[PDB]
Short mmCIF file of C-alpha atoms in Angstrom, two decimals:
data_model
loop_
_atom_site.label_atom_id
_atom_site.label_comp_id
_atom_site.label_asym_id
_atom_site.label_seq_id
_atom_site.Cartn_x
_atom_site.Cartn_y
_atom_site.Cartn_z
CA UNK A 2 0.12 -0.03 -0.10
CA UNK A 3 1.42 3.50 -0.48
CA UNK A 4 -0.30 7.04 1.23
CA UNK A 5 -0.14 10.09 0.85
CA UNK A 6 -1.45 12.94 3.23
CA UNK A 7 -2.58 16.69 1.90
CA UNK A 8 -1.37 18.55 5.41
CA UNK A 9 1.87 19.58 5.20
CA UNK A 10 1.85 18.32 1.58
CA UNK A 11 4.93 19.63 -0.95
CA UNK A 12 5.88 19.49 -4.55
CA UNK A 13 8.30 16.63 -2.82
CA UNK A 14 6.14 14.51 -1.05
CA UNK A 15 3.92 14.46 -4.13
CA UNK A 16 6.88 13.16 -6.33
CA UNK A 17 7.81 10.69 -3.37
CA UNK A 18 4.23 9.82 -3.28
CA UNK A 19 3.91 9.04 -7.28
CA UNK A 20 6.97 7.27 -7.08
CA UNK A 21 6.02 4.92 -4.11
CA UNK A 22 2.83 4.41 -6.45
CA UNK A 23 5.13 3.50 -9.51
CA UNK A 24 7.25 1.04 -7.33
CA UNK A 25 4.43 -0.26 -5.53
CA UNK A 26 3.44 -1.77 -9.12
CA UNK A 27 4.66 -5.33 -9.93
CA UNK A 28 6.56 -5.69 -13.61
CA UNK A 29 7.45 -7.87 -16.17
CA UNK A 30 10.18 -6.13 -17.44
CA UNK A 31 11.36 -2.93 -18.93
CA UNK A 32 10.97 -2.03 -22.44
CA UNK A 33 13.24 0.75 -23.37
CA UNK A 34 13.78 1.82 -19.62
CA UNK A 35 10.17 1.90 -18.89
CA UNK A 36 8.83 -0.65 -16.64
CA UNK A 37 6.32 -3.01 -18.52
CA UNK A 38 3.20 -3.70 -16.35
CA UNK A 39 2.00 -7.28 -15.98
CA UNK A 40 -0.35 -8.92 -18.55
CA UNK A 41 -2.19 -10.74 -15.82
CA UNK A 42 -2.37 -11.46 -11.55
CA UNK A 43 -4.12 -13.53 -9.92
CA UNK A 44 -6.90 -12.56 -7.12
CA UNK A 45 -5.59 -10.35 -4.34
CA UNK A 46 -2.23 -9.37 -5.53
CA UNK A 47 -4.42 -7.94 -8.68
CA UNK A 48 -4.69 -4.70 -6.51
CA UNK A 49 -3.21 -2.14 -4.14
CA UNK A 50 -4.30 0.14 -2.20
CA UNK A 51 -3.49 3.93 -1.77
CA UNK A 52 -4.07 5.40 1.74
CA UNK A 53 -5.11 9.65 1.19
CA UNK A 54 -5.58 11.85 3.42
CA UNK A 55 -7.03 15.47 3.71
CA UNK A 56 -5.92 18.26 4.98
CA UNK A 57 -9.00 17.53 7.90
CA UNK A 58 -7.30 14.08 8.67
CA UNK A 59 -9.87 12.42 6.77
CA UNK A 60 -8.93 8.99 4.90
CA UNK A 61 -10.36 6.99 1.89
CA UNK A 62 -8.00 4.12 0.78
CA UNK A 63 -8.65 3.63 -3.02
CA UNK A 64 -8.18 0.49 -4.94
CA UNK A 65 -6.31 0.01 -7.72
CA UNK A 66 -5.56 -2.81 -10.52
CA UNK A 67 -2.16 -2.83 -10.62
CA UNK A 68 -2.10 -4.16 -14.12
CA UNK A 69 -3.44 -1.17 -15.67
CA UNK A 70 -3.57 1.77 -13.19
CA UNK A 71 -7.59 1.49 -13.04
CA UNK A 72 -8.95 2.71 -9.95
CA UNK A 73 -11.77 0.22 -8.96
CA UNK A 74 -13.78 2.42 -5.81
CA UNK A 75 -12.39 3.42 -2.89
CA UNK A 76 -13.72 2.85 1.34
CA UNK A 77 -14.54 6.02 3.10
CA UNK A 78 -14.97 4.40 6.85
CA UNK A 79 -17.09 1.48 6.60
CA UNK A 80 -18.64 2.23 3.19
CA UNK A 81 -17.58 0.80 -0.13
CA UNK A 82 -17.68 2.65 -3.42
CA UNK A 83 -17.41 0.64 -6.72
CA UNK A 84 -17.79 1.81 -10.14
CA UNK A 85 -21.02 0.27 -12.42
CA UNK A 86 -18.37 -1.75 -14.38
CA UNK A 87 -17.50 -5.73 -14.67
CA UNK A 88 -13.51 -4.78 -13.86
CA UNK A 89 -14.94 -2.98 -10.45
CA UNK A 90 -17.60 -5.82 -9.48
CA UNK A 91 -14.71 -8.56 -9.58
CA UNK A 92 -12.55 -6.32 -7.72
CA UNK A 93 -15.14 -6.53 -4.83
CA UNK A 94 -14.97 -9.77 -4.13
CA UNK A 95 -11.43 -9.14 -3.05
CA UNK A 96 -11.55 -5.59 -1.55
CA UNK A 97 -12.72 -3.71 1.25
CA UNK A 98 -14.70 -7.28 1.69
CA UNK A 99 -15.64 -6.08 5.15
CA UNK A 100 -17.26 -2.90 4.39
CA UNK A 101 -20.34 -2.35 6.78
CA UNK A 102 -22.54 -1.06 3.10
CA UNK A 103 -21.24 -1.50 -0.80
CA UNK A 104 -22.29 1.23 -2.61
CA UNK A 105 -22.38 0.83 -6.47
CA UNK A 106 -21.46 4.23 -7.96
CA UNK A 107 -23.91 5.37 -10.69
CA UNK A 108 -21.36 5.10 -13.85
CA UNK A 109 -18.02 3.12 -14.66
CA UNK A 110 -14.55 4.69 -14.26
CA UNK A 111 -14.80 5.44 -18.15
CA UNK A 112 -13.38 8.89 -19.01
CA UNK A 113 -16.45 9.48 -21.44
CA UNK A 114 -18.80 8.36 -18.61
CA UNK A 115 -17.65 10.11 -16.06
CA UNK A 116 -17.37 13.94 -17.94
CA UNK A 117 -20.93 13.10 -18.77
CA UNK A 118 -22.22 12.43 -15.13
CA UNK A 119 -20.18 15.08 -13.94
CA UNK A 120 -21.76 17.92 -16.67
CA UNK A 121 -18.03 18.88 -17.31
CA UNK A 122 -14.84 18.01 -19.38
CA UNK A 123 -11.46 17.54 -18.06
CA UNK A 124 -10.42 20.48 -19.38
CA UNK A 125 -12.77 22.73 -17.33
CA UNK A 126 -12.15 20.73 -14.17
CA UNK A 127 -9.01 22.07 -12.14
CA UNK A 128 -6.35 19.99 -10.43
CA UNK A 129 -3.35 20.31 -8.04
CA UNK A 130 -3.03 19.56 -4.43
CA UNK A 131 -6.12 21.61 -3.20
CA UNK A 132 -7.87 20.20 -5.78
CA UNK A 133 -7.07 16.63 -4.53
CA UNK A 134 -7.85 17.57 -0.94
CA UNK A 135 -11.40 18.93 -2.34
CA UNK A 136 -12.15 15.39 -4.24
CA UNK A 137 -11.08 13.48 -1.28
CA UNK A 138 -13.43 15.18 0.93
CA UNK A 139 -16.04 14.98 -1.71
CA UNK A 140 -15.65 11.28 -1.69
CA UNK A 141 -15.24 10.85 2.38
CA UNK A 142 -18.51 12.27 2.65
CA UNK A 143 -20.02 11.20 -0.93
CA UNK A 144 -21.89 14.16 -1.98
CA UNK A 145 -23.39 12.16 -4.81
CA UNK A 146 -23.72 15.34 -7.12
CA UNK A 147 -19.99 16.28 -7.14
CA UNK A 148 -18.79 12.42 -7.05
CA UNK A 149 -17.84 12.52 -10.60
CA UNK A 150 -15.72 15.65 -10.44
CA UNK A 151 -14.40 14.45 -7.61
CA UNK A 152 -13.15 11.04 -9.43
CA UNK A 153 -11.86 12.63 -12.42
CA UNK A 154 -9.63 14.79 -9.70
CA UNK A 155 -8.50 11.43 -8.22
CA UNK A 156 -7.93 9.28 -11.09
CA UNK A 157 -5.77 12.45 -13.02
CA UNK A 158 -3.65 12.74 -9.79
CA UNK A 159 -2.95 9.52 -9.05
CA UNK A 160 -2.64 6.74 -12.15
CA UNK A 161 -1.93 9.83 -14.96
CA UNK A 162 0.87 10.97 -12.97
CA UNK A 163 2.02 7.21 -12.32
CA UNK A 164 2.00 7.14 -15.98
CA UNK A 165 3.64 10.23 -17.04
CA UNK A 166 6.63 12.23 -15.45
CA UNK A 167 5.15 15.24 -17.30
CA UNK A 168 1.63 15.09 -15.42
CA UNK A 169 3.32 14.41 -12.09
CA UNK A 170 5.35 17.70 -12.20
CA UNK A 171 2.66 19.77 -13.44
CA UNK A 172 0.23 18.49 -10.75
CA UNK A 173 2.78 18.84 -7.84
CA UNK A 174 3.40 22.36 -9.02
CA UNK A 175 0.61 23.23 -7.50
CA UNK A 176 0.58 22.91 -4.13
CA UNK A 177 -1.47 26.11 -2.45
CA UNK A 178 -3.43 26.82 -5.91
CA UNK A 179 -5.35 25.06 -8.47
CA UNK A 180 -5.11 24.65 -12.45
CA UNK A 181 -6.99 23.82 -15.66
CA UNK A 182 -5.18 21.04 -17.57
CA UNK A 183 -3.89 21.43 -20.95
CA UNK A 184 -4.88 19.81 -23.96
CA UNK A 185 -1.30 18.66 -24.09
CA UNK A 186 -1.88 16.59 -20.71
CA UNK A 187 -5.36 15.18 -21.79
CA UNK A 188 -3.74 13.64 -24.99
CA UNK A 189 -1.27 12.28 -22.96
CA UNK A 190 -4.05 10.51 -20.87
CA UNK A 191 -6.26 9.56 -23.83
CA UNK A 192 -3.19 8.32 -25.69
CA UNK A 193 -1.42 5.83 -22.61
CA UNK A 194 -3.17 2.89 -24.41
CA UNK A 195 -1.72 3.37 -28.25
CA UNK A 196 1.74 4.75 -27.03
CA UNK A 197 2.14 1.72 -24.60
CA UNK A 198 1.49 -0.78 -27.84
CA UNK A 199 3.19 1.29 -30.48
CA UNK A 200 6.23 1.29 -27.43
CA UNK A 201 6.34 -2.24 -27.23
CA UNK A 202 6.23 -3.01 -31.17
CA UNK A 203 9.01 -0.84 -31.59
CA UNK A 204 11.22 -2.30 -29.26
CA UNK A 205 11.35 -5.14 -31.94
CA UNK A 206 11.10 -3.09 -35.12
CA UNK A 207 14.11 -0.78 -34.95
CA UNK A 208 12.48 1.86 -32.97
CA UNK A 209 9.30 2.31 -35.14
CA UNK A 210 6.19 2.62 -34.80
CA UNK A 211 4.03 0.70 -36.65
CA UNK A 212 1.24 3.21 -36.32
CA UNK A 213 1.77 6.87 -35.33
CA UNK A 214 0.43 8.04 -32.43
CA UNK A 215 -1.38 11.54 -32.83
CA UNK A 216 -0.80 14.50 -29.75
CA UNK A 217 -1.43 17.56 -28.57
CA UNK A 218 2.08 19.68 -28.18
CA UNK A 219 2.51 22.37 -25.37
CA UNK A 220 1.48 24.93 -27.70
CA UNK A 221 -1.63 22.89 -28.55
CA UNK A 222 -0.24 22.07 -31.52
CA UNK A 223 -1.01 18.72 -33.72
CA UNK A 224 1.91 16.55 -33.65
CA UNK A 225 2.52 12.51 -34.53
CA UNK A 226 4.75 10.13 -32.87
CA UNK A 227 6.77 7.66 -34.55
CA UNK A 228 8.92 6.75 -32.80
CA UNK A 229 11.13 5.20 -29.39
CA UNK A 230 13.40 8.60 -29.78
CA UNK A 231 10.89 10.94 -29.16
CA UNK A 232 10.53 12.84 -26.07
CA UNK A 233 7.36 11.43 -24.75
CA UNK A 234 8.97 7.51 -24.76
CA UNK A 235 12.77 8.93 -23.86
CA UNK A 236 11.75 11.65 -20.99
CA UNK A 237 7.92 11.25 -19.91
CA UNK A 238 5.83 8.25 -20.01
CA UNK A 239 6.71 6.04 -16.74
CA UNK A 240 4.55 2.62 -17.09
CA UNK A 241 3.51 0.68 -19.98
CA UNK A 242 0.11 -1.29 -20.17
CA UNK A 243 0.98 -4.44 -21.71
CA UNK A 244 -0.02 -5.64 -24.99
CA UNK A 245 -1.94 -8.29 -23.65
CA UNK A 246 -4.03 -6.04 -22.20
CA UNK A 247 -4.32 -3.70 -25.94
CA UNK A 248 -7.21 -4.92 -28.24
#
């Protein structure tokens, strides 16, 4: 398990949290020195917990599938909450088994499903440490009408930062304020599977992608990634989704 406390949080402590998170995940090997997540894992071993505490010292435990960094649900005291989808329903057989009340959220963890539930797209949902604190509080008290937005903040602040150094850096920089994520940040999130697949193909194709991955750069400019020498591959992506889990 790994923990992150908002009270006393700093750019450095957020980085340490993300490093601990990445290191809590088992990997098959490294491709271009990037950890390759496992194809599959048996029962309980497939999940890990992140204990997140807000400024007010209230904690939620978040269940994460270690093969894909997908969040399954979370626990607040003795009430558990799981996404309305197959993966989460399976996770519930193994995690938070003794919760006294088990709530099924009215949506899956899919970005589009969450955005529709939140009534806002990621471009307009603030991130940064104070945002993560607000999200934790919202989830701890389960204010239903704000939960989808809180989950979008939570997912990006844990899974997306773990997957990309760039995202980790952006979120960790905002300690006493919030910010709206750039199209580049969102582009990274949307293309994690594609990038993961192409990097693995490149490893046995002389660094060449079979199919280009189109991303939006810092200047909102559209760019096409086609090989393992790109900066996104050499200096950003921190975890790779196993090709076996990519359709």
